[PDB]
Amino acid sequence: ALEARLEQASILKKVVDAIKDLVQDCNFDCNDSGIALQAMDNSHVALVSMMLKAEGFSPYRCDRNIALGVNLTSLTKVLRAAQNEDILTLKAEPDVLNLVFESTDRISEYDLKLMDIDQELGIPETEYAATITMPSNEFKRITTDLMAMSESVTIEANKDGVKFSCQGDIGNGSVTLRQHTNVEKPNESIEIELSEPVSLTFSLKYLVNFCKASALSNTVKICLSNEVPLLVEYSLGGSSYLRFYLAPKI
Amino acid sequence: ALEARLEQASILKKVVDAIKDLVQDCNFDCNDSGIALQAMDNSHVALVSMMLKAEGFSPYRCDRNIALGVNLTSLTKVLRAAQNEDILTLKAEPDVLNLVFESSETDRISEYDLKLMDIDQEHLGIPETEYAATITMPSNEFKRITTDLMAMSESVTIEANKDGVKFSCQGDIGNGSVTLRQHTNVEKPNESIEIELSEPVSLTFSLKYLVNFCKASALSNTVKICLSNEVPLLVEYSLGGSSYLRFYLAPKI
Amino acid sequence: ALEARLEQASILKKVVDAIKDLVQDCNFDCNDSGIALQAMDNSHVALVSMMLKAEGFSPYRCDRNIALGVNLTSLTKVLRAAQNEDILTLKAEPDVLNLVFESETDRISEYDLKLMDIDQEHTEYAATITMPSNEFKRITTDLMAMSESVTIEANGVKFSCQGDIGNGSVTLRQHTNVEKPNESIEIESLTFSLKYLVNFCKASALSNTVKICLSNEVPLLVEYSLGGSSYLRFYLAP
Amino acid sequence: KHQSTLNF
Amino acid sequence: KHQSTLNF
Ligand code: NA
Ligand code: NA
Ligand code: NA
Ligand code: NA
Ligand code: NA
Ligand code: NA
Ligand code: NA
Ligand code: NA
């Protein structure tokens, strides 16, 4: 059914490392478009949506649509045995996912026991009120810093910039980022597209968890609307992506 | 009352990191000379004495003498949100200390309002003391020695004479000593071992406290250790101009 | 009895760091050939055999054969107080091992370690594999995540295991690297505890290559060869 | 004030 | 050697 070669194992190791604390068990969905993951956390507060498009492999061959039911702790233990710069091949007929890691002439071969996992969801194409593009590490720094003093962050957007603010036992904290274009270092830009001002409140525990994906993408897209959940998007090469959706506090 | 701008947050982050394991609650005393801290640990065994002089800011404005009563764990959680190379502004009227952190890179502004507490000052006046011996040495050498000897003993004896200084200990596993000879390093002056002594002197101290003082190693490339039979140990991290972080430690007898 | 100077403390720090989780108490045996260690782990499953040959010191002086009965946690606490690039001198008459650490600067560190009385309990292999130390560390650490046991097959070499999550193997082909000889896999079936092999791999920092020697009749030899004919050797029952 | 669940 | 308290 499946024969999928990645030039570098790195990508699959980072994706699983980024998602495994939110989601234990889940299905990798394989079709001619490539490999997708859609899984809710236990609380139904957070949704992980990943797509590794066929273009990202060399080559990608799907002869039959399959779900790979995987425990992400098990998968992590196997992916640790891959060097970042190893050539990774996924093969499946399935009760087992075959993983081959090629260096030297060194070959690592794993047969991972799969589990039957019942797949849950349609996300509407949404015209958000505000999107903020910013460096991934800036978002990690802010969520980690504010989490020291609060369980919750408010995200306020307007034409001028975005403010992250919180309050706790020790007092109030805010971080304000002005819209700015960095000509030399485009990933360091703060870009704001907004049809209207928007303010929502989120669990910092979840946002900090999403920020474990910071190593996948130099920039992160934060999308806000009064009507719909927060989209935190880590855009990858081509049209591949890791997306986190988070229900707000109300 | 207070408006105090530091070119770099770094200094304030290191000072609090250096002090927070010795002292939980304490007052920052603000006047026209700048910002002072005098706090004893709960055992009254160790005294921290800090002065950031007005000259060290750009600018420093005090219109009224104020105490900022702060929990150093709370203050640490806020200072962690400052990059080393952020421009830091302290402002107070006070129930709240306002901290502003401005990026050296982007136009990003961090703003914190830290709840202050009423804290009764325990200030004691320290006489100008003619020590028996002072040792100037690299901060990292003092950190290395105290950390190493703490593995095998709770106590260190500090002996000074014209020739050098010896740190020695004994424990369950046996004896340890580290001896430093007086030496001038022409190329790397901070690596010098300078000894000024009116008389030989030997005292014993808790390594737990000395290791704690060595969390200030990143503030100053050199450390001044001052010894006298009569008075407590002075461990001084001298800063730019006449600013300083000083630790005083009661000896074991 | 003993006066032994190493140009760099580094070697003694790495040896003890490599051995101290397998073996708590043990004897350093000093004679005119240099300093030897032969100690079993508590289970008598693994044997550590070290020899620092006299040639490795500058100078080495033994006037009388002596055993230094040392707790390796105590010795580690003392060796931590030595910088890698310190000159290390061992001296003994013995109730005590005297260690002197000399700096860059004029700094002298001096330790007297209390010794204990410890009673000393004083092969043409089928296959040897020479490979990079870090390759052996990577393989044993990785497979230990999913299994207690590894099978080692030789003709190249395959390390394979099975466990609760499924099966794993690593295959290395015989290959000569002309530019980087330590990266070569040189080859001239048994099952082992990964817990022990991973422990042996704490010696990876002592040697760029590791020699794995296999025989149906005798225990596995994992050898970290050092400068000249000095060595750290681990033996493991299959 | 309190945590909503996911609603698309 | 017991631990004394500060005396200035
Ligand atoms: Na197809
Ligand atoms: Na893209
Ligand atoms: Na005070
Ligand atoms: Na100084
Ligand atoms: Na000064
Ligand atoms: Na001899
Ligand atoms: Na070697
Ligand atoms: Na050799």
mmCIF file of C-alpha atoms in Angstrom, chain B residues 169-252:
data_model
loop_
_atom_site.group_PDB
_atom_site.id
_atom_site.type_symbol
_atom_site.label_atom_id
_atom_site.label_comp_id
_atom_site.label_asym_id
_atom_site.label_seq_id
_atom_site.Cartn_x
_atom_site.Cartn_y
_atom_site.Cartn_z
ATOM 1 C CA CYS B 169 38.673 20.934 54.290
ATOM 2 C CA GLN B 170 38.334 17.436 55.781
ATOM 3 C CA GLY B 171 35.445 14.955 55.415
ATOM 4 C CA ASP B 172 34.485 11.249 55.559
ATOM 5 C CA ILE B 173 36.565 10.512 52.355
ATOM 6 C CA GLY B 174 39.761 12.340 53.631
ATOM 7 C CA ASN B 175 41.411 15.832 53.301
ATOM 8 C CA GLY B 176 41.455 18.422 50.469
ATOM 9 C CA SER B 177 43.345 21.735 49.978
ATOM 10 C CA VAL B 178 43.761 24.287 47.122
ATOM 11 C CA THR B 179 46.759 26.688 47.354
ATOM 12 C CA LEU B 180 47.020 29.913 45.255
ATOM 13 C CA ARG B 181 50.386 31.780 45.139
ATOM 14 C CA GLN B 182 50.430 35.611 44.805
ATOM 15 C CA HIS B 183 50.966 36.191 41.000
ATOM 16 C CA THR B 184 50.570 39.157 38.570
ATOM 17 C CA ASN B 185 49.267 38.148 35.078
ATOM 18 C CA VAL B 186 50.414 41.016 32.750
ATOM 19 C CA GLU B 187 48.270 39.877 29.694
ATOM 20 C CA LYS B 188 45.116 38.769 31.626
ATOM 21 C CA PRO B 189 44.914 41.004 34.760
ATOM 22 C CA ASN B 190 41.657 39.373 36.027
ATOM 23 C CA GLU B 191 43.611 36.029 36.294
ATOM 24 C CA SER B 192 46.059 37.631 38.860
ATOM 25 C CA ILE B 193 46.148 36.499 42.536
ATOM 26 C CA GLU B 194 46.787 39.716 44.569
ATOM 27 C CA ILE B 195 47.285 39.410 48.397
ATOM 28 C CA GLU B 196 47.412 42.500 50.708
ATOM 29 C CA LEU B 197 47.944 41.329 54.335
ATOM 30 C CA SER B 198 48.969 43.143 57.568
ATOM 31 C CA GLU B 199 49.138 39.697 59.352
ATOM 32 C CA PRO B 200 48.524 35.968 58.708
ATOM 33 C CA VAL B 201 44.860 34.956 59.322
ATOM 34 C CA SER B 202 42.857 31.665 59.238
ATOM 35 C CA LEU B 203 39.041 31.184 59.529
ATOM 36 C CA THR B 204 36.469 28.429 58.786
ATOM 37 C CA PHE B 205 33.161 28.947 56.846
ATOM 38 C CA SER B 206 30.105 26.964 55.596
ATOM 39 C CA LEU B 207 30.712 25.910 51.935
ATOM 40 C CA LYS B 208 26.873 25.978 51.371
ATOM 41 C CA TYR B 209 26.959 29.819 51.884
ATOM 42 C CA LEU B 210 30.213 30.391 49.881
ATOM 43 C CA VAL B 211 28.825 28.322 46.904
ATOM 44 C CA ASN B 212 25.648 30.543 47.093
ATOM 45 C CA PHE B 213 27.797 33.743 46.958
ATOM 46 C CA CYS B 214 29.537 32.245 43.846
ATOM 47 C CA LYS B 215 26.207 32.499 41.914
ATOM 48 C CA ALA B 216 27.351 36.197 41.544
ATOM 49 C CA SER B 217 30.467 35.026 39.505
ATOM 50 C CA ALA B 218 28.935 36.322 36.209
ATOM 51 C CA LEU B 219 28.652 39.939 37.637
ATOM 52 C CA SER B 220 32.443 40.536 38.030
ATOM 53 C CA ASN B 221 35.576 38.826 36.577
ATOM 54 C CA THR B 222 37.349 39.187 39.980
ATOM 55 C CA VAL B 223 36.262 38.675 43.630
ATOM 56 C CA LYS B 224 37.810 40.262 46.784
ATOM 57 C CA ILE B 225 37.904 37.927 49.870
ATOM 58 C CA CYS B 226 38.647 39.927 53.084
ATOM 59 C CA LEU B 227 39.590 38.170 56.369
ATOM 60 C CA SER B 228 39.957 39.280 60.021
ATOM 61 C CA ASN B 229 39.802 37.342 63.337
ATOM 62 C CA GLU B 230 37.501 40.151 64.721
ATOM 63 C CA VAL B 231 34.884 40.609 61.898
ATOM 64 C CA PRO B 232 32.821 38.520 59.433
ATOM 65 C CA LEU B 233 34.234 37.466 56.018
ATOM 66 C CA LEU B 234 33.657 40.020 53.222
ATOM 67 C CA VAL B 235 33.222 38.448 49.720
ATOM 68 C CA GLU B 236 32.984 41.493 47.375
ATOM 69 C CA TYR B 237 32.013 41.524 43.643
ATOM 70 C CA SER B 238 33.082 45.096 42.677
ATOM 71 C CA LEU B 239 31.152 46.536 39.677
ATOM 72 C CA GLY B 240 31.633 49.482 37.266
ATOM 73 C CA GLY B 241 32.312 52.769 39.115
ATOM 74 C CA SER B 242 31.663 52.480 42.893
ATOM 75 C CA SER B 243 28.645 50.066 42.600
ATOM 76 C CA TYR B 244 29.068 46.655 44.368
ATOM 77 C CA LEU B 245 27.517 43.360 45.481
ATOM 78 C CA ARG B 246 28.920 42.305 48.905
ATOM 79 C CA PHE B 247 28.318 39.113 50.929
ATOM 80 C CA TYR B 248 29.235 38.971 54.650
ATOM 81 C CA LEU B 249 29.525 35.537 56.320
ATOM 82 C CA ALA B 250 29.785 34.743 60.066
ATOM 83 C CA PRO B 251 32.595 32.173 60.641
ATOM 84 C CA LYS B 252 32.473 28.700 62.293
#
